[PDB]
Design a binder for this molecule. Structure first.
Ligand SMILES: NC(=[NH2+])NCCC[C@H](N)C(=O)O
Ligand SMILES: [Mn+2]
Length: 342
């Protein structure tokens, strides 16, 4: 396949042998030079990817009245209309179904009113099964990647996985419309918020990523005064992520940039509308909602990122008018975050 990125195959199990350490070095190097790489999918990884894309296509054909009903005031899971999300003050144009951790009202965290905790408003049970199976496979890959990354930095194999038990993994199931006006913006420039972003796309094309740039200051999106949203949109360089069959892409999120002190950067990226609609799934391999990330290479440093606080801050800014956000504000659910930080 004519591709524009490096492609690696992951071992099923990462044990810490010499081959694993070598692979970790290569993944770190690819992120440091290109900001991204591809991982080869096996037949089951690919099958589950395609079944998820098919379920997304069927869901998006449903009437807006139905899609709009798939929302929750407890969790951000569920439907986002085209034009609803905001990035740096401007609307984004995909329709989205967000899948966060699927917690019923029987869950203790939901009973306690923790922000963002609640059940996915699945459109139907076939969609549910397809997305759950796909996300379980994506999670296995995320864990492999985190073990390899630790090994490549000469850290204990468990360094990042010790933050991801019951991790706050989630996924955006996206359909981008074709460009119809002179507007070609799909999503504005941004970074995502956790450890890794693992993504799949169809054959259409539209994702651009920004590699590391020597001498370029990068905002630390975990700080309220350094948002990465809306940065570098029109400025070179941007790498086109050529659609390639049988791969997922992988790039760092904000937590990986923080923990590595910028040795890895949270990859800025944006989406442009193409002449045809475009289906994609972006998966976020995240710390536990309660985990506090810390700098690995600066053990004098007292700075921390409480991951759940970062997620909640980000989703409130994405969806300022959503019923989920309104209920966080109404019930003072951010107070739970203050207690957890103790
Ligand atoms: N929920 C997301 N991950 N959204 C990604 C797009 C950027 C997001 N709207 C922001 O302002 O940070
Ligand atoms: Mn993104």
């Amino acid at each position: 396949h004519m591709t524009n990125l490096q492609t690696f195959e992951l071992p099923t199990e990462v044990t810490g042998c010499a081959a694993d350490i070598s692979l970790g070095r290569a993944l770190i190097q690819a992120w440091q030079k290109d900001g991204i790489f591809q991982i080869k999918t096996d037949s089951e990884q690919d099958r589950k990817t395609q079944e998820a894309m098919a379920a997304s296509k069927q869901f998006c054909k449903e009437p807006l009245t139905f899609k709009s009903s798939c929302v929750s005031d407890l969790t951000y899971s569920g439907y986002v209309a085209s034009g609803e999300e905001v990035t740096a003050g401007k609307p984004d144009f995909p329709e989205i179904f967000t899948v966060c951790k699927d917690l019923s009202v029987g869950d203790q965290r939901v009973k306690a009113g923790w922000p963002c905790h609640g059940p996915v408003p699945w459109p139907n049970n076939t969609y549910q099964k397809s997305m759950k199976t796909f996300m379980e496979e994506l999670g296995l890959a995320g864990e492999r990647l985190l073990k390899l990354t630790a090994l490549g930095f000469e850290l204990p194999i468990n360094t990042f996985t010790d933050l991801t038990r019951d991790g706050w993994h989630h996924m955006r199931v996206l359909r981008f419309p074709p460009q119809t006006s002179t507007l070609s913006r799909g999503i504005g420039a941004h970074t995502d918020y956790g450890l890794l972003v693992i993504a799949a796309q169809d054959d259409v094309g539209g994702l651009y990523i920004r590699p590391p740039v020597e001498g370029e200051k990068r905002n630390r999106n975990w700080l309220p005064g350094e948002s990465s949203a809306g940065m570098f949109e029109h400025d070179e360089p941007w790498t086109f992520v050529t659609p390639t069959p049988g791969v997922w892409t992988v790039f760092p999120g904000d937590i990986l940039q923080f923990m590595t002190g910028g040795q890895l950067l949270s990859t800025p990226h944006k989406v442009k509308l193409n002449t045809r609609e475009r289906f994609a799934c972006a998966y976020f391999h995240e710390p536990n909602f309660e985990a506090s990330a810390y700098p690995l290479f600066e053990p004098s440093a007292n700075e921390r990122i409480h991951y759940g606080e970062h997620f909640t801050n980000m989703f409130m800014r994405c969806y300022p008018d959503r019923i989920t956000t309104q209920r966080i504000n109404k019930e003072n659910r951010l107070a739970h975050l203050e207690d957890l930080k103790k």
